[PDB]
Amino acid sequence: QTAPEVLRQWQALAEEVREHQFRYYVRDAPIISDAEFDELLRRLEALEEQHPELRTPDSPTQLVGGAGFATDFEPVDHLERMLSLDNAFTADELAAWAGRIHAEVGDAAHYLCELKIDGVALSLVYREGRLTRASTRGDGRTGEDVTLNARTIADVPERLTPGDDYPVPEVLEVRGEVFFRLDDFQALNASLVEEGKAPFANPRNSAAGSLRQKDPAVTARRRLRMICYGLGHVEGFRPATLHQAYLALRAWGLPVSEHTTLATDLAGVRERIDYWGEHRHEVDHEIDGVVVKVDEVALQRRLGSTSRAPRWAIAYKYPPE
Ligand SMILES: Nc1ncnc2c1ncn2[C@@H]1O[C@H](COP(=O)(O)O)[C@@H](O)[C@H]1O
Ligand SMILES: NC(=O)c1ccc[n+]([C@@H]2O[C@H](COP(=O)(O)O)[C@@H](O)[C@H]2O)c1
């Protein structure tokens, strides 16, 4: 057993050094100067001569020069199951989904209506305002660790912004989609072809590939974006509705969309569906549908979910053309 203050100091310093190493080497974007970094590494090196057991092969000092950052896609459990969505392709089906809902919950349900993004699903975990894990869908219970790749996404903050209205939760699991803008997708393809590589067939594939990189510096230099859509497990945050959840997410610095609307009944839902059927092409990223979700979280709890999907939401899918 090492003395506690020595251990405290070392974790903090090593944590800080490593973050800076990652910012400079992987992301190519430091947030402190070179001078300051140098000082930091020296201290941590001293402390490790003063206390040799602290120096291990995983330390940022001994054995990490510009390296140690790699993604291995190992399994990691999601705190809450990350399911898929049921789909509706015709007006009858949607009405049918709403009939089933009205009958169960009775005019008390309002519907958040969002754009369905055609990209890769990503799940982030923030513990005390700090991002700890990012993962793929996988089987629903377990996905893959692409933590470093997510840390390079500009949209995803490392730490959550504190505030008066919305206190940072102890644990927050957030789902959202990663994607490329069409222009960026084209641009990346040109770049790839310029180095002799094969281009990607669509933005969905391109973003998935850009995210799933063993060397995350590859990912850092690609312009992935993310828009958050969902909550998984949370502690210290109990929003009454999903629309109110997005206010908090936004206050904390997470990225949310500007095209979400709150309809009051199925008629309102139908208007949005019709509207995005006509305007979806004006958005800069791929939209294949609209997600319809009962907004109040108590109603969501009552309706629950099946093994594969929730019953409180349905995604209307457009014909592709
Ligand atoms: N706004 C959104 N809300 C929820 N899930 C979404 C949204 N946009 C995309 N998705 C993803 O779309 C996946 C499947 O939808 P689908 O297109 O029906 O297969 C969902 O499970 C989510 O991962
Ligand atoms: N500002 C930073 O965050 C930061 C982080 C890591 C390394 N660096 C710079 O990296 C260089 C390391 O040297 P070599 O990789 O060329 O040995 C140093 O000059 C160091 O200051 C800067």
What can you tell me about this protein's structure?
With 321 residues, the protein is an alpha+beta fold. The protein has two domains: 70 residues, no CATH class; 251 residues, no CATH class. It contains ten helices and eleven strands. A hairpin with a 2-residue loop joins β4 and β5. The termini are far apart. The site of beta-nicotinamide ribose monophosphate has 11 residues, from α1 and α2. Monomer. It comes from Mycobacterium tuberculosis (strain ATCC 25618 / H37Rv). Belongs to the NAD-dependent DNA ligase family. LigA subfamily. This is DNA ligase A.
Quickly describe the structure.
This protein has 321 residues and is of the alpha+beta class.
Round the Cα radius of gyration to an integer and report it. 22 Å
Terminal CA distance: 66 Å
Strand content: 15-25%
Number of strands: 11
Total domain modules: 2
Structural class: alpha+beta
**Largest beta sheet: strand ordering:** 2-11-10-3-9
Bound molecules: adenosine monophosphate, beta-nicotinamide ribose monophosphate
| Inertia-based shape | globular
The SSE order reads: HHEEHEEEEHEHHHEHEHEHE
For the biggest sheet, the summary is: 5 strands, mixed
Fraction of residues in helices?
25-40%
Q: How many DSSP H or I helices?
A: 10
